[PDB]
Amino acid sequence: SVPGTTTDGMDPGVVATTSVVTAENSSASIATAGIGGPPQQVDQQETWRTNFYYNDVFTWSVADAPGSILYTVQHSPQNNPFTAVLSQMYAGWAGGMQFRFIVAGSGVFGGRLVAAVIPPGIEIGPGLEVRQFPHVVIDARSLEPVTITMPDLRPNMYHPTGDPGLVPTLVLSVYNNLINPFGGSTSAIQVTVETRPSEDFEFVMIRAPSSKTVDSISPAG
């Protein structure tokens, strides 16, 4: 009976689902990514697949109005440190990703957050109303991590590496204002995001690394 104050590197915590996660999505995704051949790099006991790894950290203060956007991320294999290295030897990819959130607060604070998955074709910015999507509400007093999954909602049969196409976006917003009942100078907390591939992420077609290089795909280097 381990307590909630210690979290393991393979531990997702509480799994928070959303109506975009459906079984026919997964079956259609696998059966239509099958035109790239058999799936590659799908061994389930590998260390790079089982652990969560660091992505980002952001700040939530008491002055943020409800509906304010705190964190966005676009669907890509560049969000994980190890699926970005493995994309140099393949020509396609398909599948989802899991995102783990840890809120660093105490039991004296108040306020809630909201998370939803946005389908492709929709502009992400101010005025995007997250609470009128299918959403999950997370309290500021949560001790265990919360993990939600972003699936692959695409109009192609796979994503080419140079040109993926349309992708969904994960947006986290403010449900209610953060409250400190004492009042004073301490008005901020921090949330950390980590990432892990889901059970149906795969690559398809092998190619030479001396093809279109890593300096022609993204200007990160």
Binding site: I69, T72, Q78, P126, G162, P164, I217, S218, P219, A220
Partner: protein, 109 residues
């Protein structure tokens, strides 16, 4: 813009930190960036209305900068005109595409 210590014709001995003041000249892009932008094509990397974001960490604080489709660089600082020191910089890490109407975090502490 990107500041640089450039000598002047009234005092060719003057360097950074001199008692007569420091002379600065600015450019829009760093030279390796514009060399790399003329060898590759990145149409399929950023929609119009997005920034490509890098995180820069220091000994005390951290800030974010962004690159538009047009090739300009941005930082979220408001109306301040103070030069950023950029001496105790430690690490640079990529982040990826973000919406353009989102404030880049700027705290040096």
């Amino acid at each position: 813009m990107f500041a640089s210590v450039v000598r002047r014709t009234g005092d060719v001995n003057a360097t950074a930190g001199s008692a007569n003041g420091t002379q600065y000249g600015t450019g829009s892009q760093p030279l390796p960036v514009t060399i790399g932008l003329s060898l590759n094509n990145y149409s399929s990397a950023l929609m119009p209305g997005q920034f490509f974001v890098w995180q820069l960490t220091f000994a005390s604080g951290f800030m974010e900068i962004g690159l538009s489709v047009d090739g300009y660089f941005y930082a979220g600082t408001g109306a301040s005109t103070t030069l950023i020191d950029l001496t105790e910089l430690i690490d640079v890490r990529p982040v990826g595409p973000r919406p353009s109407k989102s404030t880049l975090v700027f705290n040096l502490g």
